[PDB]
Amino acid sequence: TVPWFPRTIQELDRFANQILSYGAELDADHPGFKDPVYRARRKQFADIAYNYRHGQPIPRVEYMEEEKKTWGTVFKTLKSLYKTHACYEYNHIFPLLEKYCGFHEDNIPQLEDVSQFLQTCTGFRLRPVAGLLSSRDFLGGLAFRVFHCTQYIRHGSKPMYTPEPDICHELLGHVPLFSDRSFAQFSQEIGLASLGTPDEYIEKLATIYWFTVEFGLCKQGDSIKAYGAGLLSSFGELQYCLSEKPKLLPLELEKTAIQNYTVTEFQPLYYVAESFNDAKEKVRNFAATIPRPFSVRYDPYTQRIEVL
Ligand SMILES: [Fe+3]
Numbered sequence: 001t002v003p004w005f006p007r008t009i010q011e012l013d014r015f016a017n018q019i020l021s022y023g024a025e026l027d028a029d030h031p032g033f034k035d036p037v038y039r040a041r042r043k044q045f046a047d048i049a050y051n052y053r054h055g056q057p058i059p060r061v062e063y064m065e066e067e068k069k070t071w072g073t074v075f076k077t078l079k080s081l082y083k084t085h086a087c088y089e090y091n092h093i094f095p096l097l098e099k100y101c102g103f104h105e106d107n108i109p110q111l112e113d114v115s116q117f118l119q120t121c122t123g124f125r126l127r128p129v130a131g132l133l134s135s136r137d138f139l140g141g142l143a144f145r146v147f148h149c150t151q152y153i154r155h156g157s158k159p160m161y162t163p164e165p166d167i168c169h170e171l172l173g174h175v176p177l178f179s180d181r182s183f184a185q186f187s188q189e190i191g192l193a194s195l196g197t198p199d200e201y202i203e204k205l206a207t208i209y210w211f212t213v214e215f216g217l218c219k220q221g222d223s224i225k226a227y228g229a230g231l232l233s234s235f236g237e238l239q240y241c242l243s244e245k246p247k248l249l250p251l252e253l254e255k256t257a258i259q260n261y262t263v264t265e266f267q268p269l270y271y272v273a274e275s276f277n278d279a280k281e282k283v284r285n286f287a288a289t290i291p292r293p294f295s296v297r298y299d300p301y302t303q304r305i306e307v308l
Pocket of ligand 1: 165169173174214229230
């Protein structure tokens with residue numbers, strides 16, 4: 001048989017009831033483990049994601065001074081590297097995010113405002129997400145240009161560290177790239193390639209996602225820059241990734257999809273994309289080889305996937 005997949009954007013609502021219910025915040029080594037206030041705050045954000053329904057505005061949240069401080073520290077520290085380390089598309093949109101979304105050290109941008117801004121850029125939109133979605137569900141949302149986004153922030157005791165994505169990572173790492181046309185298309189191609197795809201191939205696409213959307217390097221003229229969200233939200237790894245230490249290889253999906261990696265240390269190897277249009281073409285070609293008895297297409301006019 002073929003695994004179920006949403007045919008309409010509203011159907012993404014099925015995902016909220018298929019996440020991992022025992023999150024990282026519950027682990028003994030989590031920065032906020034012993035903090036009961038943090039614990040309740042996280043549950044509060046998880047309840048918002050749980051009750052969220054496609055089409056609704058994303059609830060605004062008054063962040064505490066402590067949380068704004070953690071955001072400020074992360075913002076301030078990462079900002080210094082973007083001009084020289086981030087890909088052109090990133091730096092091109094950041095000023096706009098600062099002007100229209102309140103991307104500033106003293107303020108944590110609200111997801112609703114960021115979502116509206118993205119929608120006017122590429123039709124991408126955000127949906128608050130509780131915890132960990134399976135790769136199949138996470139990738140599936142991209143097909144509709146929907147990005148499942150965390151709303152909670154890392155624990156304040158370790159502002160430069162997070163064992164999971166949190167709002168700083170989503171907004172400083174992912175968001176600026178989703179405002180780029182080609183990137184949006186490229187991201188969506190991965191999502192489309194995952195619809196109704198067999199588990200074994202979902203894993204291949206998750207790995208490709210890891211080496212592009214999360215830890216990708218882009219060719220820029222005769223130079224190289226970072227566009228991966230995991231890099232763009234990592235002070236240490238962002239500087240490291242463009243140094244002489246890591247091994248760099250051309251994005252080549254047949255090899256990239258099988259490549260192992262660990263999410264604990266700096267990546268020893270990175271794949272370099274020629275451009276987002278090219279990475280998009282490569283994904284499309286790779287999707288072609290995935291054994292699926294059907295073809296899928298997204299119709300932005302009706303917000304439905306057409307199955308051939
Ligand atoms: Fe991420």
